[PDB]
Design a protein around this motif. Structure first.
Motif, PDB file in Angstrom:
ATOM      1  N   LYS A  19       0.784  -1.232   0.000  1.00 54.29           N
ATOM      2  CA  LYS A  19       0.000   0.000   0.000  1.00 54.29           C
ATOM      3  C   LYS A  19       0.821   1.289   0.000  1.00 54.29           C
ATOM      4  O   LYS A  19       1.691   1.483   0.849  1.00 54.29           O
ATOM      5  CB  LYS A  19      -0.963   0.006   1.191  1.00 54.29           C
ATOM      6  N   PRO A  20       0.537   2.194  -0.954  1.00 52.26           N
ATOM      7  CA  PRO A  20       1.239   3.475  -1.077  1.00 52.26           C
ATOM      8  C   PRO A  20       1.268   4.189   0.268  1.00 52.26           C
ATOM      9  O   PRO A  20       0.291   4.163   1.015  1.00 52.26           O
ATOM     10  CB  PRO A  20       0.411   4.221  -2.117  1.00 52.26           C
ATOM     11  N   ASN A  21       2.390   4.831   0.565  1.00 49.97           N
ATOM     12  CA  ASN A  21       2.563   5.522   1.838  1.00 49.97           C
ATOM     13  C   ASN A  21       3.563   6.656   1.604  1.00 49.97           C
ATOM     14  O   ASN A  21       3.927   6.939   0.468  1.00 49.97           O
ATOM     15  CB  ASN A  21       3.131   4.525   2.856  1.00 49.97           C
ATOM     16  N   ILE A  22       4.008   7.298   2.677  1.00 51.28           N
ATOM     17  CA  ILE A  22       4.991   8.370   2.571  1.00 51.28           C
ATOM     18  C   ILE A  22       6.043   8.149   3.650  1.00 51.28           C
ATOM     19  O   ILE A  22       5.706   7.938   4.818  1.00 51.28           O
ATOM     20  CB  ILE A  22       4.350   9.761   2.786  1.00 51.28           C
ATOM     21  N   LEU A  23       7.315   8.172   3.262  1.00 47.67           N
ATOM     22  CA  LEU A  23       8.385   7.991   4.234  1.00 47.67           C
ATOM     23  C   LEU A  23       8.978   9.357   4.554  1.00 47.67           C
ATOM     24  O   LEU A  23       9.228  10.155   3.658  1.00 47.67           O
ATOM     25  CB  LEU A  23       9.480   7.071   3.694  1.00 47.67           C
ATOM     26  N   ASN A  24       9.210   9.609   5.835  1.00 53.57           N
ATOM     27  CA  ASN A  24       9.738  10.890   6.286  1.00 53.57           C
ATOM     28  C   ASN A  24      11.054  10.786   7.050  1.00 53.57           C
ATOM     29  O   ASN A  24      11.286   9.835   7.803  1.00 53.57           O
ATOM     30  CB  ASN A  24       8.726  11.578   7.218  1.00 53.57           C
TER      31      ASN A  24
ATOM     32  N   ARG C 234       5.902  16.573  14.761  1.00 50.75           N
ATOM     33  CA  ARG C 234       6.598  16.645  13.482  1.00 50.75           C
ATOM     34  C   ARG C 234       5.700  16.473  12.248  1.00 50.75           C
ATOM     35  O   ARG C 234       4.706  15.752  12.287  1.00 50.75           O
ATOM     36  CB  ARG C 234       7.699  15.578  13.482  1.00 50.75           C
ATOM     37  N   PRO C 235       6.055  17.136  11.132  1.00 49.66           N
ATOM     38  CA  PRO C 235       5.287  17.063   9.880  1.00 49.66           C
ATOM     39  C   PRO C 235       5.429  15.689   9.235  1.00 49.66           C
ATOM     40  O   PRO C 235       6.499  15.085   9.296  1.00 49.66           O
ATOM     41  CB  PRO C 235       5.902  18.173   9.039  1.00 49.66           C
ATOM     42  N   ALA C 236       4.359  15.200   8.612  1.00 45.87           N
ATOM     43  CA  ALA C 236       4.383  13.869   8.006  1.00 45.87           C
ATOM     44  C   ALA C 236       4.395  13.822   6.480  1.00 45.87           C
ATOM     45  O   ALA C 236       4.082  12.781   5.885  1.00 45.87           O
ATOM     46  CB  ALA C 236       3.225  13.042   8.545  1.00 45.87           C
TER      47      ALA C 236
END
Ligand SMILES: *[C@@H]1O[C@H](CO[C@@H]2O[C@@H](C)[C@@H](O)[C@@H](O)[C@@H]2O)[C@@H](O[C@@H]2O[C@H](CO)[C@@H](O)[C@H](O)[C@H]2NC(C)=O)[C@H](O)[C@H]1NC(C)=O
Ligand SMILES: *[C@@H]1O[C@H](CO)[C@@H](O)[C@H](O)[C@H]1NC(C)=O
Lengths: 99, 8, 274
Positions: A19-24, C234-236
């Motif tokens: 599943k698409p996500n966002i890494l920070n 923190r920003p995500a």
């Protein structure tokens, strides 16, 4: 005023393979401002990394965010490598999906 | 909008 | 509630590598919306939030021109400071500035401010009354005297009470669907083993906006605030924020601790257990 950066790696959503996500990668509390940040996938630099949310707190230390879109896999590993004058060598922090 | 600064 | 317009400006010299790098980042509350980076190929003020698409091409030209002028102003400031402090031109130095205003729910000015730092330390700051400056050292005192004779306080005050307030109102109006929203945090608890025969409990709060939030751990109904660990909010990466707070508890005694999450998007605070 030379402060070593705190490096935090996390996903936007709880990870789910496929599943698409966002890494920070949030790099904070550092000084001076010069710094190099790279996000890695299986030890290789990720090309489309976006830099954003640059700022500084009341004590003037800097804060900045690096983030990219990604689709977690059970065995792909991710990390964030940072280079700052307060350190002799680059520091690589991994994404700990179980944190 | 941003402010127009002048040297310190 | 109250809202703010803030600009973070940084100028860093780099002897032997060319001109100083100059950057400007603007925020409406906790949301980035504009940016200027002298290290770009074709340096220009650019939108960082979707709603800024509502500004015409002249906005960008105007702000771009302003930014280029500020860059030069700070480049001169860097050079001038070497004189005030009697420092060598071979070292790298940094100038920082936060400038902004805040209005109440009714769009009326609550406070204005603009503070400087040189190499991480207070240099000069505008006082609350927006009429005078306070200098951290003798170098800043020179700046204070120059600015006073130049009438800078009056010019800055006019910006803070007028321009700053008026544009913030406009920004909040144009991006109301983004800036005036509320995203409720989704929470969960993770559990981790420790050698000492006890466990680490970590409370996570995800996908929320605005950024302000409170996470606490309770035992017997009392906050363990003291003995817990946490990270700054923190920003995500998508305009939302996240945070976590942990506490180390005795193995087997996990169910006695509860996590509390207070947020604008939580009518009633969340209470979680492991
Ligand atoms: C956000 O505000 C708009 C009001 O108009 C806006 O003005 C522009 C400057 C820009 O901010 C755009 O978003 C809009 O054009 C709301 O849109 C109106 O909503 C009313 C209900 O209050 C509706 O009856 C009208 O048809 C809408 N008018 C237009 C021109 O679309 C919008 O609903 C607001 N969104 C939120 C989440 O509050
Ligand atoms: C400036 O510093 C130099 C040493 O680098 C010293 O020789 C000189 O006297 C100083 N000038 C003043 C006014 O303190």
């Amino acid at each position: 005023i030379q402060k070593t950066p705190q490096i935090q790696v996390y996903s936007r959503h709880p990870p789910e393979n496929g599943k698409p996500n966002i890494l920070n990668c949030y790099v904070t509390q550092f000084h001076p401002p010069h710094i190099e940040i790279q996000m890695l996938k299986n030890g290789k630099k990720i090309p489309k990394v976006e830099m954003s949310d640059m700022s500084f707190s009341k004590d003037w230390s800097f804060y900045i965010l690096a983030h990219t879109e990604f689709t977690p896999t059970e065995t792909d590993t991710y990390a964030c490598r940072v280079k700052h004058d307060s350190m002799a060598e680059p520091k690589t922090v991994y994404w700990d999906r179980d944190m | 909008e941003q402010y127009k600064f002048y040297s310190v | 509630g109250p809202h703010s317009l803030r600009y973070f400006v940084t100028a860093v010299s780099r002897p032997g590598l060319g001109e100083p790098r100059y950057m400007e980042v603007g925020y409406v509350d906790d949301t980035e919306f504009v940016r200027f980076d002298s290290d770009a190929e074709n340096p220009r003020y650019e939108p960082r939030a979707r709603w800024m698409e509502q500004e015409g091409p002249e906005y960008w030209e105007r702000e771009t021109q302003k930014a280029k002028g500020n860059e030069q102003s700070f480049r001169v400031s860097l050079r001038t400071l070497l004189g005030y402090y009697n420092q060598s031109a071979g070292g790298s130095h940094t100038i920082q500035v936060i400038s902004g205003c805040e209005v109440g729910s009714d769009g009326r000015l609550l406070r204005g401010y603009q503070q400087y730092a040189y190499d991480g330390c207070d240099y000069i700051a505008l006082n609350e009354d927006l009429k005078t400056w306070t200098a951290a050292d003798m170098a800043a005192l020179i700046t204070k005297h120059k600015w006073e004779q130049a009438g800078e306080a009056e010019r800055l005050r006019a910006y803070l009470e007028g321009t700053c307030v008026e544009w913030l109102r406009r920004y909040l109006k144009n991006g109301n669907a983004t800036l005036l929203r509320t995203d409720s945090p989704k929470a969960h608890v993770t559990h981790h083993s420790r050698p000492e025969d006890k466990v680490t409990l970590r409370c996570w709060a995800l996908g929320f906006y605005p950024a302000d939030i409170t996470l606490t751990w309770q035992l017997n109904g009392e906050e363990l605030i003291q003995d817990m660990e946490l990270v700054e909010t923190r920003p995500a990466g998508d305009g939302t924020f996240q945070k976590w707070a942990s506490v180390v508890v005795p193995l087997g005694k996990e169910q006695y601790y509860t996590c509390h999450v207070y947020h604008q998007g939580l009518p009633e605070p969340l209470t979680l257990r492991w």
